[PDB]
A paper describes a structure:
Enzymes of the vanillyl alcohol oxidase/p-cresol methyl hydroxylase (VAO/PCMH) superfamily are found across all kingdoms where they perform a range of metabolic functions. These flavoproteins share a conserved FAD-binding domain and a more variable substrate-binding domain that enables interactions with a range of substrates. One of these, the 4-phenol oxidases/dehydrogenases, catalyzes the oxidation of para-substituted phenolic compounds. A fundamental distinction is that the oxidases efficiently react with oxygen producing hydrogen peroxide whereas the dehydrogenases hardly react with oxygen and typically employ other proteins, such as cytochrome c, as acceptors.
Among the proteins of this unexplored clade, we chose the enzyme from [name] for experimental evaluation. The absorbance spectrum suggests that vanillin (peak at 340 nm) is produced, though the presence of the quinone methide intermediate (peak at 360 nm) remaining bound to a fraction of the protein molecules cannot be ruled out. These features are consistent with molecular oxygen being an inefficient oxidant for the enzyme that is therefore identified as a vanillyl-alcohol dehydrogenase active on the typical substrates of the 4-phenol oxidizing subgroup. To pinpoint structural differences induced by Pro151 mutations, we crystallized VAD and solved its structure. With 46% sequence identity and a root mean square deviation of 0.89 Å for the Cα atoms, its structure closely resembles that of VAO. Conserved features include the dimeric arrangement, a large chamber at the subunit interface, a constellation of active site Arg and Tyr residues, and the substrate binding mode in front of the flavin si side. Pro151 is located within a sharp loop that covers the flavin edge on the re side of the cofactor ring. The residue is in the cis conformation with its carbonyl oxygen atom pointing towards the flavin N5 atom. Conversely, no tunnels are present in the wild type and the dehydrogenase mutants where the flavin re face remains fully shielded by residue 151 and Trp153. We found that wild-type VAD is anaerobically reduced by vanillyl alcohol with a reduction rate constant (kred) of 0.50 s-1 (reductive half-reaction). Specifically, the re-oxidation of the dithionite-reduced enzyme is 52-fold faster than that of the substrate-reduced protein (kox of 14000 vs 27 M-1 s-1).
Numbering used by the authors:
A (entry chain A), B (entry chain B): 2 to 519
């Protein structure tokens, strides 16, 4: 059971837990044996009093949110907002600090608007990708949504954390437009056009007038987000998902070189993802099926996985969108960029001899379909937890191969398999490292923790920095953005002390602490 | 001559001007008769005491900028940052509050980088569209810029003020990525990946890590931007500008209905502008050759203006960009959207009998070429001054024609010709009123001011709010954004006090005043 947070007497807490009970009822304030679904499901720390929520209030309306926050102020008790708390690999529901009261907003799951003609939604935090998909399919509206894989999570929560998907609307927060925010002092505000009485333009024009501030409430503890609009892609006129595989590990250098101009110009219309053999193999197989050793898979077994599954060492999944004459012209350009590489194979779905297969699973994500497979890369090594390192780099052959060499060496030295991805949004490259681990074994937890810290250090040194991370590592990732003795984070703390003078919102989110605890 | 700001002695002001000239050098502080170019070129006020800058100071570098800002805190003297200060329809280089010192960053004009492979540029505030386009050409870089019409101003200032242009990169601040900011306390920060030392990714990935704050320094007085990256469209494989004209003034309703889907699915790849006959005639004609009288042009004349200029009542020019196969597909989808309207005509550039012409002139702008010509809204009625009203609205026929009617009637009622434009970014329609008028005449200035206030009130009362405005009206536009007793401006005022406690940056900007002056 979790301790109190330093500064909060037992009376103050228990008073506040009763005053929270007034505001939302006594059935929607959770303690004790009801608390554990909001623990980190993939624990990394071997000290068991870190990332431990004291309680979990669960309001149903914006107004409750406001009082909660006013009470939180009154008793000096900190809160930790989560839209749905399916933030797996990042801590799930749990706070950075022990003792903070989770503020859960599953209950505020009203899809407030879905406009077909203008291509947007207005949703509250609780709305899941599944819920929003379904409501669209039931009404037969000709709109796609843009989805993580698997499609756990909140439309809102995923976006606020700068999350990403697999269609042209892949940059979730880029597609955001208008939000309502409960400030730390209890007051509510609407950004953009939503600050105009009588507007019909909240989800039509991001800026509004004057300082553009939506972004400060993303990867932030500056407020609580109670509604958010997002743009949604009109159902296109055509769709052709594809896979391009490469034989050799070294091919990732030339592949990244070829990908650059296609991505910088928008020729490839969604995110480009080039995945290593084991990360894609892990969509349909486990390690035990290919190798019995405790260590990482040997060359000879890779060759066997590649022949068996018609994957490469590298595996480029992508999709063409819009009308057929357009899709034909983009294909011509993309295909001719890769054709002259020894060993390259190209595949549309109908060229896939297997009926369970990478491309058929990926095609669902690249058309906005939230799919919940019980078979992914978590199962690879018998099951457990995952963590991901996804730093930014320039889209260059040299930057890719370097990251690959650095990470695969270290990852394999520590006994894990290399599960890597090269991902391009538009002008950004991300070498994403996935490490699966047994989160019940304390010695493996030690290995992972250490390996992680070394990867951050070595990548920072090469100018590569993380954009999204686990609650455990939030302070560490803040420390990488250290230009001029932490000038940026000094400003954030200025803003934090002004909006939240009593430090009751998500203390330590993104490394932002507030004067009382700093 | 101009007065001291209230709360600022001449002892203070005089010692602060010494230090300034100690920092930058005596030759780069301006007073007396050298303030004349920092005056609003297009005056609206009859009160000769308002929007009058006490002095200017022209730093050579970011660090001189910091030095000045520190001096400004310690003597309570306020600063009005301008990049090149060419903000002509919005009060130009002058400040809301008289006595404010102009901080003129035009000497800070380095092109720090232009990168071809990654399509981007890093620029100081003084860099003009013309300097950047010329740099690019000198070096033979296959990049386009995105430019206003005409293109006299600042890549940075325009972008910070939510400027727009005529390519797919038409939304300037959208395309921005990374910036260096001198805060109101004199500390300097870098945003995004720029906060990480050794990064090569400042201009490739907006977010960095944690709260997204670039927006807070646009249309704001929260800091002074000293560096900014912007993304730059790579050279397309083909480019075809077009013009479509509409016979009847009522055509705009159904036209706006047809633009919606084409714009939302991105079939029209740049901003969609639909201009009124009179707006173009008054660039490349005179009033007296069509109608002799003192008042606004009668319906009679319109049919004559139309045949003379080979235009319509509404005139839509856009451009297709891509390999010819893709442009063809788009043209077909766009021509077929409008083919069935009575009176529609279709023009490519070589179909234009006139070589001084809207399409030919716009073909330059929609491929990112900045131009000055011998033309503008003068030599129509001996005007000189102009001001714009550009609120946001849904893309509907009903909304378009409704604002057409609302505005024209009122503009004509006040003696001005109706000069209008319907523009669509992505999901956002603006009906834009250009109001041309005599700067010199105090009788037309008065009427302009009564007319402007009405337009604001009436558009606001239907839920259409402005996104960009003249220094004179900043408070009024701000007060339309009033949901929940001006909650949003109450938050901005909070932030202003934390960052700028002495209130020395640009008091009034976007109606943001801060504690001392409220
Ligand atoms: C196997 C696997 C695959 C994954 N694949 C992807 C993928 O493809 N793409 C991807 O983007 N992610 C991916 N993830 C990460 C994660 O599981 C998803 O992003 C998930 O959909 C997001 O969780 P959520 O929506 O519940 O967010 P939440 O946990 O509800 O919110 C995220 C965080 O943001 C803040 N926050 C959220 N809502 C609010 C609010 N209303 N007000 C204030 N602060 C708030 C909090 O600090 C919160 O902890 C993957 C994870 C795993 C384990
Ligand atoms: C005939 C005519 C046509 C026009 N056409 C267009 C058009 O097509 N598109 C368009 O967008 N505009 C247009 N404009 C408006 C205007 O001329 C342009 O926006 C111009 O490019 C802006 O001048 P600038 O870049 O020098 O801005 P500046 O005056 O330098 O900056 C504008 C404002 O931004 C802020 N600012 C500037 N620099 C900084 C900084 N470093 N830090 C903090 N705040 C800062 C200040 O508040 C300043 O008042 C037109 C105007 C006229 C008169």
């Amino acid at each position: 059971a979790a301790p109190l947070p330093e500064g909060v007497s037992a009376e103050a807490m228990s008073s506040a837990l009763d005053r929270f009970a007034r505001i939302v009822g006594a059935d929607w304030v959770f303690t004790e044996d009801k608390i554990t679904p909001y623990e980190d499901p993939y624990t990394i720390s071997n000290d068991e009093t870190e990332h431990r929520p004291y309680a979990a209030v669960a309001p149903a309306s914006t107004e409750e949110v406001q009082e909660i926050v006013r009470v939180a102020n009154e008793f000096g008790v900190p809160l930790w907002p989560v839209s749905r708390g399916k933030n797996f690999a990042y801590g799930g529901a749990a706070p950075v600090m022990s003792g903070t009261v989770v503020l859960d907003m599953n209950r505020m799951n009203r899809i407030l608007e879905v406009n077909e003609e203008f291509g947007y939604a207005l949703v509250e935090p609780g709305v899941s990708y599944f819920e929003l998909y379904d409501y669209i399919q039931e009404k037969g509206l000709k709109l796609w949504i843009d989805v993580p894989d698997p499609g756990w999570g909140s439309v809102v929560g995923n976006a606020l954390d700068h999350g990403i998907g697999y269609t042209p609307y892949g940059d979730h927060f880029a597609m955001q437009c208008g939000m309502e925010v409960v400030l730390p002092n209890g007051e509510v505000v609407r950004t953009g056009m939503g600050a105009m009485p009588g507007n019909n333009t909240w989800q039509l024009f991001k800026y509004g007038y004057g300082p553009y501030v939506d972004g400060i409430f993303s990867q932030s503890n500056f407020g609580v987000v109670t509604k958010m609009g997002i743009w949604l892609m009109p159902e296109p006129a055509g769709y052709r998902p594809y896979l391009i595989t490469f034989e050799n590990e070294d091919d990732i250098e030339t592949v990244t070189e070829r990908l650059r101009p296609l991505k910088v110009a928008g020729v490839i219309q969604n995110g480009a993802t080039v995945r290593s053999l084991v990360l894609d193999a892990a969509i349909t197989r486990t390690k035990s099926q290919y190798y019995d050793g405790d260590g990482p898979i040997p060359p000879s077994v890779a060759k066997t996985m590649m022949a068996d599954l018609d994957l490469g060492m590298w595996n480029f999944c992508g999709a063409l969108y819009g009308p057929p004459p357009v899709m034909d012209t983009l294909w011509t350009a993309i295909r001719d960029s890769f054709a002259d590489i020894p060993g390259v194979k190209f595949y549309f779905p109908e060229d896939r001899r297997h009926k369970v297969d990478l491309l058929l699973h990926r095609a669902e994500t690249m058309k906005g379909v939230p799919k919940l497979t019980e078979f992914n890369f978590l199962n690879w090594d018998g099951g457990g937890g995952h963590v991901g390192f996804s730093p930014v780099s320039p889209i260059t052959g040299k930057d890719a191969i370097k990251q690959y060499n650095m990470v695969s060496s270290r990852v394999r030295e520590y006994g894990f398999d290399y599960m890597g991805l090269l991902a391009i949004g538009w002008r950004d490259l991300h070498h994403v490292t996935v490490i699966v681990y047994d989160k019940t074994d304390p010695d493996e937890r030690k290995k992972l923790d250490e390996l992680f810290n070394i990867l951050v250090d070595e990548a920072a040194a090469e100018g590569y920095g993380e954009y999204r991370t686990h609650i455990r590592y939030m302070d560490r990732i803040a420390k990488t953005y250290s230009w001029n003795d932490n000038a940026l984070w000094k400003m954030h703390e200025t803003i934090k002390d002004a909006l939240d003078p009593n430090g009751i919102l998500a203390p330590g989110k993104s490394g932002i602490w507030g004067k009382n605890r700093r």
